[PDB]
Each structure stands twice: as C-alpha cells, then as structure tokens.
C-alpha cells in the first residue's frame, strides 16, 4: 500500500516547486541510513553496481536502483552517514587495479595498498563483475600444477585452468594444502621460463586481522611473496567489501592469463563469501530462499569460478587456477553451500578430522577426493608410477578391516596389507616441506615395485630421507633426466631398479 522515497520531508518539496535543484542525476540526498545500507533519494543517471561517495568520505555501491530511491551499500561504518547528507556519484562501475606492479604488496577489496610500501604501478583497470570465457576460447588442461605433496601429485592431480575445491572441517587440512602449493613454485618462478611460472593470488576473506599477518610473514621468509598477490578482506569491515573480494581478486589475476602467463587464485574461504552476500541482500528488502540465502546463491559462486579457465593458443596460451576452500560444518559434504561448490568445480579435495589425528599429514581421503582432468594434466614420468599405485590403494582400503586379525591372514591378504601401509606412510609429508617431481617419482617407484616391503612400518620415515639424500650424490644423472625430459624410457627404468636394490641391503 505505502511506499518510501517521498515521505513527510521528501514529500514537502514538490508542492511548492517542481524544480529546486537542477541535478537529481549525479547527486542524491540520504534519507535513511542503517545496517550498512543507505537509501539515497535521487541519482537517476547512476548505473547499476556503480561507485558512490558520501559527504563524510565513505564510499558506496548502488545495487538496488528503485524508482524513487536508490539502495547503496556503504563500504565503511554507518556512524559517518546521517539523514540529509549529500551522496555524489563517481560515474564508473566497481573496478579494481591490475597489472604486474601489484606483486609484492597486500591490497584490499578496492585496490588500495595496506602493506605500507607506497603506491602500486597499475597498468590497467578491470571491472569486478566481468564475463567468463566462452566455449571457443578454451582448450584442454594439459599443463601440470606442481603442488609439492606426494598424495596430491599422484591421486587427484590438478592442472592449469581447472577448479579444485578444498573441502574440509575445522582444522583438518584446508588452508595447509593451498599454502604448500604456492610455496612450491619457487623452482619455476626464480628461473627464466615464463610459461612454467605461476603467480599466486591468496584472497583472505572472512579471516581475522591476526590470521592475515601470520600468513604474509611466513611467505616472505621463504622468498614466496615477491610474485603472490594478497587480497586482504577481514571480517571487521562492511558486508560489501567481503562479498566483492572474490570478484576483485579474480580481475587482478586475469591480467596474467590474458598476456601469456599463468595464475592461481586461492579463495579462502568459499563459506565466508556466501555469508557476506546474504547479509547485504537481507537488508535491501529482498526475499530469501534456502538456508537464509538469496535467489542467486548458485549463480554467485558459479560466475566467479568459471572465469579461471585455460585459454587456447590464439588467445595467448595462459591459464588460471581457482582453489576455493569450502569450510564444512561437521563433515557433511552434502549441505547447502557445500553441494553448490562441488558441482560447479572439476574436482574436490576432502579433508577429514579423523585421519589427521592418526598420523596422515595431511588428511586427504583417496576414496572421496578425485580429479575430473585425470592423467591428462600431469607429467609422463609421474604417470607411470601413479597408475599401479591407484589400484593397490583402492584394494587395500576395502580390505583394511582385516588388520585387527593378523593371525588369520592368507598369502594375498598379507601382501596387500604390507604394501598398502608403506604406500600411505610414504606420502605423508611435513608442513612447509614440498617435494619436486624428481624426488616423488623415485619414492613412489620403490613402494609400488616391492622394494619397501622388507622394511618395517616404523622405519618408513627414516627411509624417505636416506634414499633422497643418497640419490643426489651417487646417481645424480637419473634425477636430473626425469625432471628435464619429464618421462621415463627403457634406460631409465633399468638404472632406477639397480640403484634401489643396492641401497635396500643396508
């Protein structure tokens, strides 16, 4: 029945004169402010998702353009805005800075530097709400993404241009897999090959102020923050800054894929970005849906994840990786926000809290995590050892219940239990200790052939460091040939079997 806009104060202006101010297009008057929402009266020339500016200095984004008023979401505190303040329009959309000058500094959600290192040399300005790539400008995932983990490079191997989800519970291996993959790219980014490097893009959304400072200090000590973008977006800001953190970080990382380089975005986390979008929609007088979310809940996460794809040779040859972490409740992977992110991505890495307390570092379930790319985006040297290890790991998981009754084991049951326990313990790595492709191919070949069955279960940790150190001083030609060529011929298979048999006698 009733409406807003013209009411009492705004209604007693058109009766005396139908003119007053000649603007009513580029400016507006604030009529109601609260809960991070400002109902600016006027601004007829303001476009959708356009930047605004108040009289106190706080910025806004007009997203609910009505017929009488204009709902703008303030990016700061609501104490600076009041009833009757002037709100001007910027004339442009919500954009952010991009280019090669943003590497080495921590930016916010709008592109402003917060690390305190001066200005950022931006080479371009890209919008936040950008379109994804089409079906004609995309190619197959052929490049391999070296993560460093032995259980990630052999099982669910991710490639350049795909979307690998990082599902898990609280403190189970969510942010640990993303931090080890970005720090393992130091062997390719420090060289001269531009096609082998991958610029990281950590987008901390929903975290606290102490969590963002601890992650940036650890990457600078290992020479990993010089080519990694940091998008600071804490929970102490407004709901508009945290919800637009996924779109602003994807626009800055898209400049490298469109030029001829590779990028890797890590949206940490995907659960915090969905809570920021539903908070601004509930205050703008909109209808809700399931789990107190808007109607475009599935379209908000699918639009930002489809832009990270692998381009073809006619577009430049670049790619972009999306590592969204889905923070689950209590291990339920079939929830509301968990099911939407797993169906849109081409693979998901599950992390259970029960396997992390047993000794598996990190807790990565092989029976629940899978990759849609398969062995097409991996090295040829590591694909020969991962083919036989996948069949042995699947057979040992189904027959793992017979481990409690070792006095009734047969011949085939004792061979699968001894080989399955040594393969799972060899893939367990420590924190911030990534391995290369040459060191992981020699460790996986000794456990799949049968050279590690004679050793004990407790000596699996000491055998990983003894075999890697002896192979770098005695047989250095076999490790260097597997990394340069990337495959294994007939001469490399005979030299690897003779070196592993001579070192297993001591």
């Amino acid at each position: 029945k009733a409406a807003p806009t013209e009411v009492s104060s705004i209604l007693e202006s058109k009766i005396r004169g139908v003119s007053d101010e000649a603007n009513l297009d580029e400016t507006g008057r604030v009529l109601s402010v609260g809960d991070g929402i400002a109902r600016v009266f006027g601004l007829n020339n303001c476009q959708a998702e356009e930047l605004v500016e108040f009289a106190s200095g706080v910025k806004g984004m007009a997203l609910n353009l009505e017929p009488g008023q204009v709902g703008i979401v303030l990016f700061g505190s609501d104490r600076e805005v009041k009833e009757g303040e002037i709100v001007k329009r910027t004339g442009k959309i919500v954009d952010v800075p991009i280019g090669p000058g943003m590497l080495g500094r921590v930016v916010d959600a709008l592109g402003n530097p917060i690390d305190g290192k001066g200005p950022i040399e931006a080479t371009g300005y890209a919008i936040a709400q950008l379109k994804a790539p089409g079906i004609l400008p995309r190619r197959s995932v052929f490049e391999p993404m070296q993560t460093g983990l032995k259980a990630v490079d052999a099982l669910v191997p991710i490639g350049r241009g795909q979307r690998e989800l990082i599902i898990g519970d609280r403190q189970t291996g969510k942010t640990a897999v993303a931090l080890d993959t970005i720090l393992n790219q130091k062997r390719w980014n420090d060289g001269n090959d531009e096609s082998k490097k991958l610029y990281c893009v950590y987008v901390a959304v929903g975290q606290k102020r102490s969590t963002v400072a601890q992650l940036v200090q650890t990457l600078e000590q290992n020479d990993a923050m010089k080519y990694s973008i940091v998008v600071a977006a804490t929970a102490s800001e407004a709901a508009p800054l945290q919800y637009l953190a996924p779109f602003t970080a994807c626009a800055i990382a898209e400049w490298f894929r469109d030029n001829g380089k590779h990028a890797l975005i890590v949206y940490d986390d995907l659960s915090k970005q969905a809570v920021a979008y539903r908070q601004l929609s509930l205050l703008l007088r909109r209808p809700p849906g399931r789990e107190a979310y808007p109607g475009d809940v599935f379209y908000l996460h699918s639009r930002l994840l489809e832009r990270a794809a692998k381009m073809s040779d006619a577009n430049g040859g670049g790619s972009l990786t999306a590592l969204p972490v889905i923070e689950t409740q209590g291990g339920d992977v079939s929830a509301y926000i968990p099911t939407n992110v797993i169906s849109i991505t081409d693979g998901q890495i599950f992390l259970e809290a029960e396997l992390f307390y047993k000794g598996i570092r990190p807790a990565i379930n092989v029976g629940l995590s899978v990759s849609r790319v398969g062995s097409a985006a991996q090295v040829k040297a590591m694909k020969q050892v991962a083919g036989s290890l996948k069949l042995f790991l699947a057979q040992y998981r189904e027959v793992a219940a017979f481990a409690q009754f070792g006095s009734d084991l047969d011949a085939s049951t004792k061979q699968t239990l001894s080989r399955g326990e040594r393969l799972t313990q060899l893939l367990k790595q420590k924190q911030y200790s990534p391995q290369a492709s040459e060191e992981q191919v020699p460790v996986i070949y000794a456990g799949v052939n049968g050279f590690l069955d004679n050793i004990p279960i407790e000596r699996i940790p000491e055998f990983e460091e003894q075999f890697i150190a002896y192979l770098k001083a005695n047989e250095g030609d076999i490790l260097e040939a597997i990394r340069t060529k990337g495959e294994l011929s007939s001469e490399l298979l005979d030299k690897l079997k003779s070196a592993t048999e001579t070192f297993v006698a001591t």
């Binding site: 609260g34 009757g84 609280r170 102490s236 709901a239 307390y357």
Partner: protein, 471 residues
Amino acid sequence: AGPASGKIRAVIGAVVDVQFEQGELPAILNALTIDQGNNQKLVLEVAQHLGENAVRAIAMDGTEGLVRGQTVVDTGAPISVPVGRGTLGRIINVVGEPIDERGPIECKQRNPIHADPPSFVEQSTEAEVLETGIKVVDLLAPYARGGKIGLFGGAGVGKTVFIQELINNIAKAHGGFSVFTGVGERTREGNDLYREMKETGVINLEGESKVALVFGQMNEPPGARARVALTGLTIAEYFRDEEGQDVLLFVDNIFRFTQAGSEVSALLGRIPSAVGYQPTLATDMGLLQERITTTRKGSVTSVQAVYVPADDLTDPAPATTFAHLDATTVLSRGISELGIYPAVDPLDSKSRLLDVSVVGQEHYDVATGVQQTLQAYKSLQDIIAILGMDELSEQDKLTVERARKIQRFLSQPFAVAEVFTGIEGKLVRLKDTIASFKAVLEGKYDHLPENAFYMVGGIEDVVAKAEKIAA
C-alpha cells in the same frame, strides 16, 4: 548550550524511536540521555535512522514509564566509559557508572565504547606459549600469549569453572592488569567472583588492584547485554596502548554477545537469518574480535568462553568465532559424566602453538603420540562391544590399557572446584607434564593401575597414590 532535544514517538520494547529537529539529529552509536523519576538516567544508543527527522534508538535499561513526547537530550558522542587506573577494583556497568557502592570513579579521561579496530600494518605476530597449569592444556592445545582463547562447551560441562581456575594461577602472578568483563552471566556468579578476588589479593579496596570488574548479566534488557562487551574492552585497550601493559580480558560468556543482538534485530526492521539469528552476525562479531588483538604498543591475551547451544558446534554463533581464536579449548559433555575434571577434549582442541618450532622437537613428539593413541582407541572400542576382548591381540590389549590411564592423568583437581571434589588443588608445570607423558608412553608405568593417575598431578603424585592404595 546547543542540546539536541528529541521527542519520543514510538516505544515497543527495547527499541525507542526519537524524533528530533531537521539537521540537529544525532549520528549512529550515540548515547541519548533521558530524565526519569529517580536520580539516574535512561541511556539509549542510536542504532539506525528511519528518516523524516527521526532515528530508532535502543534503550540500555528498562523502557517502562516512557510516554509519547518526552524529552530526549543527546550527549553528542558515544557511550563514554571510565578508563585508566581508577577502574581497577570497582564494579562498572555498561554506561560507565559504579555499581559497587564505593563512590564515583575519579577518572581524568573518558573514552567511547565504539571505536575502530587495528589496521593490517599495525598487527604484530608472535609465537610465545603461556603456561596455565593444567596437564591437558600444556600438552595438547597450548595457549598463545597475547592471542584470543576460546573455551567452547555446553551447559553444565565446565565453562565457568575453567575461566575461574585459570585466573587464580595466571592473572594473579602476571605483570599487567586483568579485565573481567562478564556479559550474559548470572546474578550469583557476579557476587562470588568479586569476593574471591578480594581474599587472594587481586582486588584490594584499601590498597592496589589489578582487575577491572564490568557488570552486566542477563538481569538487564537486550541493549545492556549487547553493549557489555564494548564497555569492558574499552578499559583494557587503554592499558595496552596508552600505558603499554599486557592486559588480560576475561569474557564470560562470549556467546551472549551474539545472542543479545538477535533479540532486538526483529524489532529494528531486519530480516531473520539461520536458526533465528540476525543477518549481520559475521559483521558484528568481527568488529569486536579484531580490536582485542596484539599491536605494537602492547599485548592483549583474551580468554573468552564460548557457550555451545545444546552441545552443537555447527551453530552460527560457535562456528563463526573459531576463525578468530588461536587456541580453542572445546569441551565435550560425554567426558564430564565419566569423571574427567575437567572434560578437556584431546582431539577436538587445536592451537597454533602446537608445532615443533615453538615447543621443540621433544614436545612435538609427545603431543602427536598421545593424539594417535587416543584416536586409535575409539576404533578398537566399537569392535569390543560386538565381538569382545577375544579379537584383540597383544598390541591391541596394551593400547587399550594405556589409553585409559592417559585420559585420567590429564584431569587434575582445580583450586576453585574444591567444594565439589573434596581433594586439594594441584598445579603442574610445563616441564613436569611433558616428562610424565613421555614415560608412560614408553612402558615405564605399565604395571601401575588406572586409579593412581586419576585426579593426580604429575609423575610424583602418580607414584605416591599407587603405594597408598595397595596398603
């Protein structure tokens, strides 16, 4: 003077709409005074502005007796509270007034309760451990110095007894001052906490005190409970920035801050979220947790206690506070019924200081070995309920006996819980707890019984209890 006088137009519960003049309207988070019939006043914080020279304000007390058209003067700023050394030893309220009947707080300055948090460049990372005295806190999830600590738990698990026992052995020997700000507590818990600090030397009425008391339980309305966290944190932030001291903020409970804002969110014109919560749950919780951190001027070890709703960690008020805390001490209701005092979860509790580069290589192997033995006992217990003890071998039989003795050795008698247990309180150090856990996992205490380690201290108390029980 130019006092912004306002007229009350609407009054429905805690929310009260005040109508002022054009241009002289107050801003958000502004204290509005109102003259009543007594000698006090009616504090009202402006939440939002409905328009037409009117703004909706939230009363911090009882709204009974307000008529349509009363005078509502504006203070011009926010809710000012007394800071400095004068607030130590006195019971302050949500508006900054004394409730201890000891005269007025002689403070030279008065800071507001609403303030911005620290920036990303002013953050100072650390990796120092803080010894509490418990055997299950110094071995599993260690508390970080200057960080946020969360004691998660249900009703009747041991959330109030965990914060009282830690303040009697860490806050009483610290160099800085404490700040016990209770939000959403009980009426009997506020009187017992003030009398215990006076007999131990924490709050001296005739000498010097180092503990700030901030009242505000569930006996008031919804406006005073939501503003109790901002009033108590303003006095502790001044001692770490202007004075530069390691303050210790004790919130009890931390779950009452999010539940107080959802009670008045329906009358303010906001749509409800999940489980009957407010839409700005992640925005209101992050604005108060980021300000209680450690900067370059001083540290602030926050030891808040989270209350799980009916023992559920998947709620919107418990899962949103787990990302803004270093050490999380989650409690389970199943371990409290078996006799473990307190019910400390050895697998659900995690911390950022549980690494080999902070506690050492010797302490890292003892924490990983105790967690692996406790996790393996849960899988072996399910087979014993259907098959029995005949399916266990020699290695499975020794692991079941070692897991039962390790769970009872971590439960020590607290000093504040002497009226319910009967025995005296024991305090174990950090070096004695790591040496006793490593000797039991090797096979040096396999001949001892399980009752010698229950309700004991370190390795010295376990050997004396076994010889006295056999005589």
